[PDB]
Design a binder for these strands. Structure first.
Ligand code: MG
Ligand code: MG
Ligand code: MG
Ligand code: MG
Ligand code: MG
Ligand code: MG
Ligand code: MG
Ligand code: MG
Ligand code: MG
Ligand code: MG
Ligand code: ZN
Lengths: 59, 51, 37, 115, 62
RNA sequence: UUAACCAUUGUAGGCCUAAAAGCAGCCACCAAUAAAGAAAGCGUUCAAGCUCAACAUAAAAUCAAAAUUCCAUAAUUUA
RNA sequence: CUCUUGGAUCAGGACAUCCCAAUGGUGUAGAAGCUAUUAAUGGUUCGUUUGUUCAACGAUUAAAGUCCUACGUGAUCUGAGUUCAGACCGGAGCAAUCCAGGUCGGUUUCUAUCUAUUUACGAUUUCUCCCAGUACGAAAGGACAAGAGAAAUAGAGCCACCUUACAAAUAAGCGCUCUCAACUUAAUUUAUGAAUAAAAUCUAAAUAAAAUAUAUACGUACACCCUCUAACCUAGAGAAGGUUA
């Protein structure tokens, strides 16, 4: 049911996710709602990734 | 998807894998294969010549 | 739509509204009086 | 292919072009997005310490098949309003000028021979 | 049947319109007489102004 | 301290101001009426005209929490 | 009282926007203009010094934007100056010499060890015609939007022709061909409607719509599992890759 998660407050419209392709002009910033539309699993996965220890065993 | 081949070629200098694949279809080998995106209504049986 | 630090009513007919996250003073009689914050 | 500083021949009966001068006329500007001028293009000419508008009617560079290639770069002087400076032309003029986008009727009237 | 452009608006005295099989030139009396367009087309190769023009040859600059 | 309803008159008060009439001034600033300032504003060449306050009728109730590419992840209640 | 910058080449980025785009107000009739909001999409020319204390002039353009990046950039290149060894004038010093004064001439080399990097995409602008000499306006004058055609630059390819070479079967441009879709928005403008007794209100109330530049929801391209003595090749530095009565 990762599609049915809920956000408190106005986080849907205020939380931005950032990524860079690596080429000039490759910086993209997207809001939480937009990312949830494209991928129904990305939000939950990103939260878990951040909380794990930053080492090789994380992957 | 459908795969199409053309331009019959010699059989002598080819790997066995390719020769086995063509023997099943009962045709001599072709130089090149490519893929085409086709809808269900437009599907055509394998082995049919095109013009 | 002059954007000003302080928005002030300029005539009796001027009225105030809260649209799309900002404060507006709108007067129909005098479109000159329209302002945004 | 007329460019800045190209030397051109005035094929016209106007006194300004006809009178001999120690310097031949030279192009100063081409009224195109590109700098290259072909048949049917206006240019800015420097004549006898003066500037005048002019029109290209022939050149030595090859074109598409079935069109005439001349031996010299020929030009006609044009007034600011667009009326021809001269009153007669004797050298043959191409017939492609009739349909090309632009104002060529006035020059066509004065020209006798079309090749 | 194609559309037809109007030419000579820049000029204040001479206007010409080119139809498919007809050509019409309008101008003031002073402009008409100077260019004398009737003479040329009537007398195709015998025009007086054309005869005045000549040819050029020279062995050396002298 | 307010949101509802309204407006008659002595006379257009003098004053070189044509006229400056509640309103340019300029001094006075009084009158009737339940209730009406020789008027708190607009606006008229001056006048007209629009308002305010009055007439009854209602109701509510001070400061403070810029130039390479965003940058831990997240979270409102268990003594 | 004094005393490092230009150019070439290739550009990365900001928005405090010059042009192209969507809008509000006007002392906005039309056409021109003046001012403000939103947006970084790609673009943003060619020549020249008689006078001008960090200026000017000619011809054009839809426009010839303002800035940051140890002058962005000299182990990629180059011109002044910092600045000397020679030599002259002008002003000083008895002289040797001197000057934040004039001028002419005048020497920096690099074989790349490490990081980093070297194989697709779905376009911008201008002009003519048409609407129409219409709308508007007393006249003078003079447009929207919608439709059509031409170009120019940018990108990707190609050789029937033309042109230039090898006085070779090929390579090139000065020759020829092809270039498109928007799920997801901002300034703004409408519709229904409470707080607030309405005939109120576009709504950081619950709702329904339209509307820049962007972009990747959506497509194209790619997909194969691979014999090899050797020879040949429109494939190539090597290796790899393709072809074999
Ligand atoms: Mg750049
Ligand atoms: Mg801005
Ligand atoms: Mg360097
Ligand atoms: Mg020397
Ligand atoms: Mg020197
Ligand atoms: Mg020197
Ligand atoms: Mg290396
Ligand atoms: Mg139109
Ligand atoms: Mg209601
Ligand atoms: Mg309403
Ligand atoms: Zn107002």
């Amino acid at each position: 049911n990762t599609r049915h998660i809920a956000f408190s407050g106005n986080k849907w419209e205020q939380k931005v996710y950032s990524s860079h392709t690596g080429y000039p002009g490759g910086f993209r910033q997207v809001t939480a709602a937009q990312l949830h539309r494209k991928d129904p699993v990305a939000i939950v996965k990103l939260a878990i990734y951040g909380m794990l220890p930053k080492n090789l065993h994380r992957r | 998807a459908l795969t199409v081949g053309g331009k019959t070629v010699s059989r002598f200098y080819k790997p066995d894998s390719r020769l086995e694949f063509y023997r099943d279809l009962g045709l001599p080998p072709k130089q090149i294969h490519k893929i085409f995106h086709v809808t269900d209504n437009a599907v055509i049986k394998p082995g049919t010549p095109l013009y | 739509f002059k954007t000003k630090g302080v928005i002030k009513k300029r005539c009796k007919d001027c009225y105030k509204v809260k649209r799309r996250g900002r404060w507006f003073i709108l007067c129909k009689t005098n479109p000159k009086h329209k302002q945004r914050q | 292919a007329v460019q800045k500083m190209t030397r051109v021949r005035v094929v016209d009966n106007s006194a300004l072009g006809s009178t001999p001068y120690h310097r031949p006329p030279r192009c100063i500007h081409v009224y195109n997005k590109s700098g290259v001028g072909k048949v049917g293009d206006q240019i800015l000419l420097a004549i006898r310490g003066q500037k005048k508008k002019a029109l290209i009617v022939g050149h030595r560079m090859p074109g598409s098949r079935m069109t005439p290639k001349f031996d010299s770069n020929n030009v006609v002087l044009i007034e600011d309003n667009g009326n021809p400076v001269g009153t007669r032309i004797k050298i043959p003029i191409p017939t492609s000028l009739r349909r090309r986008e632009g104002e060529y009727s006035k020059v066509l009237a004065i020209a006798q021979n079309f090749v | 049947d194609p559309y037809v452009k109007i030419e000579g608006k820049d000029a204040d005295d001479w206007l010409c319109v080119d139809f498919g099989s007809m050509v019409i030139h309008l101008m003031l009396p002073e402009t008409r007489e100077t260019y004398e367009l009737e003479k040329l087309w009537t007398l195709r190769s015998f025009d007086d102004q054309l005869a005045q023009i000549a040819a050029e040859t020279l062995p050396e600059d002298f």
